């Protein structure tokens, strides 16, 4: 099991100026269209089996000022999913952010297991 | 050499309310951020060689409305783009559009050669 976020930072209620979402694999992917020209920093809490991602808890995206603008949590009702599902939820999100000229950096673990 | 687009279509000028344009290779994807939940159809005029694509002249995207909301055109300063470039511009455009809950359909010719 791995962690990039304070139990606080993962339990922090957050909201969007311009809500967007996309449901993939077993993964909900939300992200605020309002954000542009910022650095976004990706932090995932997740589990691992045999040196590889096993299950995602939450990935959240922070700005320089530590605000969260996008999350990638499992589906509430129907969460079962693989890790190949995750790499895509991320491509998806990252893709959306970079459309608004934001530049993206990812947690170290996030790059090891994805 | 293939043409989904009547000359009027590929020549006509067109506008956006929430413009956004990414770059990839020698190609310039612009899209109107202001469009939500519309069906978009991709028509592309392009040159083919053998049984695969050669040079995009342009790819525009239309609502059932006939209005063009996106365009993947070759950058004038450097004009050269690649086959793979085009594959990327398109994926990028789908993705950027599909965030606004838009549904896409591609011309036969596009699906055939890309």
Residue numbers in the entry:
A (entry chain B), B (entry chain A): 89 to 202
What does the paper say about this structure?
During infection the influenza A virus NS1 protein participates in multiple protein-RNA and protein-protein interactions to perform a plethora of functions. The N-terminal 73 amino-acid residues of NS1 form a symmetrical homodimeric RNA-binding domain (RBD), which is connected to the central effector domain (ED; residues 86-204) via an inter-domain linker. Present models of the tertiary and quaternary structures of NS1 indicate that the protein possesses two globular domains, each capable of forming independent homodimeric interactions. Our bioinformatic analyses indicate that the N-terminal RBD forms a very stable homodimer, while the predominant and ubiquitous helix-helix contacts between C-terminal EDs bear many similarities with weak transient interfaces.
In contrast, several possible ED homodimer interfaces have been proposed based upon crystal structures obtained using NS1 proteins from various strains. While the helix-helix interface appears to be the only dimeric form of NS1 ED consistently observed in all crystal structures, it remains possible that other dimeric states (such as the strand-strand dimer) contribute to dimerization in solution. Although the helix-helix dimer interface is shared by all structures of the NS1 ED, and may have some biological role in that RNA-binding activity of NS1 is affected by its disruption, we noted that in all helix-helix structures the arrangement of the two ED monomers differs markedly relative to one another. Previous studies using recombinant Alb/76 and Ud/72 EDs have shown that a single W187A amino-acid substitution is sufficient to prevent dimerization. However, at this same concentration we routinely observe complete dimerization of the PR8 and Alb/76 NS1 EDs.
